[PDB]
């Protein structure tokens, strides 16, 4: 958990393991408030929005695709929190 | 299309979860208020009363109408903007151009020398009269 | 290890065509943390700050 919060803080600002420290504790904080999800949990719901969004931006192959790429992600069979994955990628769009 | 991604959040709880009353009452209720909104549009359109120009009026007046509560007064809004956009076709066809094309009547300004043109009171635009004339 | 290499490559493909601008190392920090039941609405605030 703390090891991990810590590394992505580190990596994403290219700074070392102690430079990181103001960020670190404004992260731990923000988590520690809202640590676990307040939504439903519902991959379906993701999927679509991912999908209207591309219909939104008429960059509709890239849409077909992602379907695609889903598809296979869901196929394999290795994550099981997939939604906040995807959920966090479409927020960073 | 939006609506029917709502439904189907309900087969998932079907799937996991339990029977609730309150569920479907406090999932349903942010949503039935929209529907009842969409219905008294779609309600005062079934009665044969408003042809194209003037629907708009009527939607805009509405859509000054609810002002008040802000949830509902955005979806007023993006009917009487993503609806507004053929008719704003037009406006720019006839105010750049001076060139007046509709397959039915959409725009109130209907050809039939100095040159008449005759308007109706048919159709009418969202903003009313001091406009209409310029 | 074959299996999550391959899911990680579905991941990177998906990452470039939302354009998120993430890369393999964060993206894979992102999905250990997702995967522990972590919030990503917090998470994304916090991604945002950090890129910031």
């Given amino acids: 958990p703390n090891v ?90 | ?71 509902a007064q955005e979806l007023c809004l993006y009917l009487t903007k993503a609806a507004s956009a053929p008719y704003f076709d037009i406006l720019e066809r006839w105010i750049y151009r001076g060139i007046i094309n509709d397959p039915y009547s959409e725009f109130m300004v209907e050809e039939h020398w100095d040159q008449r043109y005759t308007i109706v009171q048919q159709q009418i635009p969202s903003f009313l009269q001091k406009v209409a004339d310029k | 290890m074959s299996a999550v290499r391959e899911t990680m490559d579905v991941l990177l493909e998906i990452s470039r065509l939302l354009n998120t601008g993430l890369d393999m190392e964060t993206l894979s920090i992102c999905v250990r943390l997702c995967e522990q039941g972590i919030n990503p609405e917090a998470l994304s605030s916090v991604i945002k700050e950090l890129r910031r």
């Fill in chain 2, 1 to 71: 299309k939006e609506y029917m991604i709502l439904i189907s959040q309900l087969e998932h709880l079907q799937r996991q979860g339990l029977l609730s009353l309150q569920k479907l009452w406090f999932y349903i209720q942010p949503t039935l208020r929209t529907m009842e909104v969409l219905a008294s549009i779609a309600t005062s359109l079934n009665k044969g009363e408003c042809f194209g120009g003037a629907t708009l009026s009527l939607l805009h007046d509405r859509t000054f109408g609810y002002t008040g509560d802000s949830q």
């Fill in chain 1, 4 to 93: 991990l919060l810590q590394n992505l803080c580190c990596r994403i600002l290219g700074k070392g393991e102690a430079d990181v420290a103001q960020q670190f504790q404004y992260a731990v904080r923000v988590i520690g408030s809202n640590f676990a999800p307040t939504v439903e949990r519902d991959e379906f719901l993701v999927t679509e929005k991912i999908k209207k969004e591309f219909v939104r931006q008429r960059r509709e192959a890239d849409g077909a695709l992602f379907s695609e790429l889903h598809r296979k992600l869901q196929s394999q069979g290795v994550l099981k929190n997939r939604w906040s994955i995807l959920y966090l990628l479409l927020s960073l769009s």
